[PDB]
Design a protein around this ligand. Sequence first.
Ligand SMILES: [Mg+2]
Ligand SMILES: [Mg+2]
Lengths: 29, 257, 253, 374
Amino acid sequence: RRTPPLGPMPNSDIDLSNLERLEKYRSFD
Amino acid sequence: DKAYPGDRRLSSVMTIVKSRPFREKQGKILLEGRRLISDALKAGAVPKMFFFSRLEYLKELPVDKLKGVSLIKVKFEDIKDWSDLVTPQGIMGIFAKQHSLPLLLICDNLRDPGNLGTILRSAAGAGCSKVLLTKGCVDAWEPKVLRAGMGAHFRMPIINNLEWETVPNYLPPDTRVYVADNCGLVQSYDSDWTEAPAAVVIGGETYGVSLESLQLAESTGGKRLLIPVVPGVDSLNSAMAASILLFEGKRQLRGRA
Amino acid sequence: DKAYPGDRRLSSVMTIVKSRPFREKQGKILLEGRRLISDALKAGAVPKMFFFSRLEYLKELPVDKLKGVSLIKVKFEDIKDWSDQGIMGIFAKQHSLPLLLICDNLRDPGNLGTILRSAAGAGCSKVLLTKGCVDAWEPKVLRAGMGAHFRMPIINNLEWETVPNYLPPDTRVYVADNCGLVQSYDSDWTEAPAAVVIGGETYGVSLESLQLAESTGGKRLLIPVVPGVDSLNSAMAASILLFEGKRQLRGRA
Amino acid sequence: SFADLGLEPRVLHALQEAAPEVVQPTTVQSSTIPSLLRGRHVVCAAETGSGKTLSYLLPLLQRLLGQPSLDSLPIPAPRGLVLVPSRELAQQVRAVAQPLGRSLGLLVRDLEGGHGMRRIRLQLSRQPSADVLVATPGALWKALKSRLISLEQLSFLVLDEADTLLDESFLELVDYILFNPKAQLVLVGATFPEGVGQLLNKVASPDAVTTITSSKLHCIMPHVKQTFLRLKGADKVAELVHILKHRDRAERTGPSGTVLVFCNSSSTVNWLGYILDDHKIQHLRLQGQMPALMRVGIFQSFQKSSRDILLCTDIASRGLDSTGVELVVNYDFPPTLQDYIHRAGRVGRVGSEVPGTVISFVTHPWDVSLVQKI
RNA sequence: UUAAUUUAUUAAUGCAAACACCUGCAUUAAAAAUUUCGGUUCGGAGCAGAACCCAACCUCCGAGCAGUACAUGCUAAGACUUCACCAGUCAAAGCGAACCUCAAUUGAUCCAAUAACUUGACGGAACAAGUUACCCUAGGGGCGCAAUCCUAUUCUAGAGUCCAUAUCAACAAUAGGGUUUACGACCUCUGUUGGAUCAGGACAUCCCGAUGGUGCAGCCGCUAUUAAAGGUUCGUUUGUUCAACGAUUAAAGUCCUACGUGAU
Ligand SMILES: [Mg+2]
Ligand SMILES: [Mg+2]
């Protein structure tokens, strides 16, 4: 079998078609 | 470049190499081998086309050997199908089809490529200066013939367009014609073939010598020369007999009797 | 005539003829060809089994040549697998100043058979070969030999060691090579016994045997080549040497 | 069918290119493909060359479509991995993967021992990182020990010849390869011996199993005719030569006489091959003792079917998907009945459609195999 | 028995031992003896000009190395265990510190040496033919006729596009082949290469027909399409469909037909 996450999986919505269009964590803070 | 083995030029080359009547009708012969092509160019043959595989075309030395002939690049399958040998020679040429006391050897009738090549190698070893054979349809650049000659057949002064009719005209000079057969006894070492010029006529191993040539050998001032067979075997290979006769002639011209 | 194309006679014949190691394991040779079988029967080869093809038995002349062999009428497939030959015969596989022709190392079977026929013609009293890797029961060697090897004193297990022990008599070991110049006719191999060594075509002449030929009282003998060819045929050179030796023992020098 | 799997336009176009050999998914392929597309870690035993590799790859392609390219950063390892026990099987798998990935974005690579590690650890091979990588365990272990590859970046693992990967020589290297444990694991094979399956249970948690055909000893294919050798070994090779004479009829009609010979020992294979090449047979021999370049050339020739007679050692018994496989001779009967059945399924690998001939020699050690022949 | 293996025993040799005879050791045989004949090589530049790869019996420099070392600390719980030990390993807390060069310079197991450390050129089961239509014990299952095949077929039901009667055909039915089964014991104890023959099929046409381009002025050609209506020889060597030889032809094309056709 295969257990996926019960709730919303992390990093799911912020992917989108254009991954390079993300703002990205430029600062470590 | 020729990559497709079904090309019309490749098919024509295969038909010319496989069929000697095609070589006679087209007036062209194919010689496989860089050394064979060099020997043909040195002997006076004019090449009309040069075939270079993917290996010999990279050398550019065989490309220099064309001397204005048509050079075509050949694939591996095209070279394998075109060449009559299992190993296709990288450089091939499609071309148009005596010393003092010289050794002249005349080979009548059909002869196998292996026997002809062995005779050529033995004659090159002995140093025969003249070879006459059957008519122009016989090609000495065939892969069986070239492989049997071990490069000596390309290196020997052999005339392939001599034919049975013009051979008496090509050897009408002061050379004692002798018949070499098992029923000839004079002996082979008991002949004057070394103190004077000799035009040796020998038939095929399974074809035999013509009775007209045997009569003409006695007619031309020579005598029938036989090999003394100490054993019980009536006849050996014709190439071995030719090698023994050439060795006896070379020894007797080297001061022996 | 056998009903199966894979007949046990046909299978055994194809195994012995096609594989010369299988011929050595079986200890048999194949006389292939009516002229070759006639030459072998005249040369002293005794066949053990006979195969007569579809058109060979129609003439039945070769059926007269049997005189007690195991005669099996040979059909299509046995002849075809035996073709490498319709008259097929499965046969069993030092004098004063002795003449020995020694072929060092292994060699091709057709050239070996041609050399065997040449040595039979010359009349050499001994034929010497390499070790157990040299095979005289090869059907190609029998075909090119014209059955003469049965009549010649040929031993293929003599090897590089025991053959020198087999020739410990006063035989002038002569070195025959392209770099030997003494000459071949300039040797005393006919006025005295000689041990003429001829190297393999693909292996050459061993340096130990070349040194031992000069050591054992002989000299390096070379064939003079007027032409541009670097080496002649080994069988042709051996035939030339045997003819020169026979001539010089027949009153020449 | 295949459209029930929701194939991509590249995947659908490649499946249409696989026609007429693929007009719909096989029943075993139907059972395997979408369950793998459900992401469940499972093992499937079925017919060899039955499109099971394609069934695993299509769900793998769908899963890789749901994976981001940000994990494809330089220096890291692949997310989609495949394992094969032989360099030839890995090469065939890589060749099959490169055809499907020509119209896709997945990079397909192969790794095996005995080859050029400079090309294996090349900057566009190891460091640039690929989507699909089929690797032998030895080369992968050498890369991991030398830090030329990683194991935390994997997300979809495929174990081809998993029973052969469960070999005692092969289990330790696989366990050393075993690494994120949350990746989707799929194993493929022809049959599952029990003593290895519980070994999978050493690293398993609620998996699944997909079995095909008869649940009993599925020894006889309905499209393969089999014979029993009622003769001693001494003339059997000669009988094989007689069979070669029978194969001579197969050489006559143009109906393809590609013959694969089973030999247990590489030196015995060499002796038999020297005999056959002596017997004027166009035979090529592949073995674990063969040179790697020589083995590669022989495998390419067999892929082109250049040598109608080819002998194979214990390295080349199973997993073969060879076109035009019409003649299969167990010159040596396999020491395992599973191995004999796997060699049998190696021929006629186009499916239930392409026919072939099977002949197996019988020796004294194989006498107990006669009951296995029952 | 030329399955395998010996060789107790002879017979030869040869070598020993003793001065032709005896004994011992090897080899060879003859003869024996023991046991088998199963079941259902590696790198840098170009060819390869801008993520990979790329080819040549490709174009040039190179390599079987050389030089330089051997906190890489101590202490200390708790674990793994070479299936014993020995030998080996992992590692938490504490004390004391930080916070190889090369350009390639190399190869693999296996058998070696070495007590070992170390040094040498991608899966590795102990082995034995064929017959018993003589084996032996023990286990498992002409004459009589045509009941059957039988054919100059009647009624025509019916198929046969229509049309029972071009042809076929069932039910019953005039009957009477001695070729098949017994009934009675009548005179009694899945064959095979050529070839001969006959050839059928395909064009992927060797020639001929019709064309297009041509490095086609014309004659000869080449290429490509269409065309199976037609043919594609004779002999020599060799039993080989191939190959060499001569005369040829407008051409001497190829294969398939159980690599066609032997129930002669
Ligand atoms: Mg259990
Ligand atoms: Mg059960």
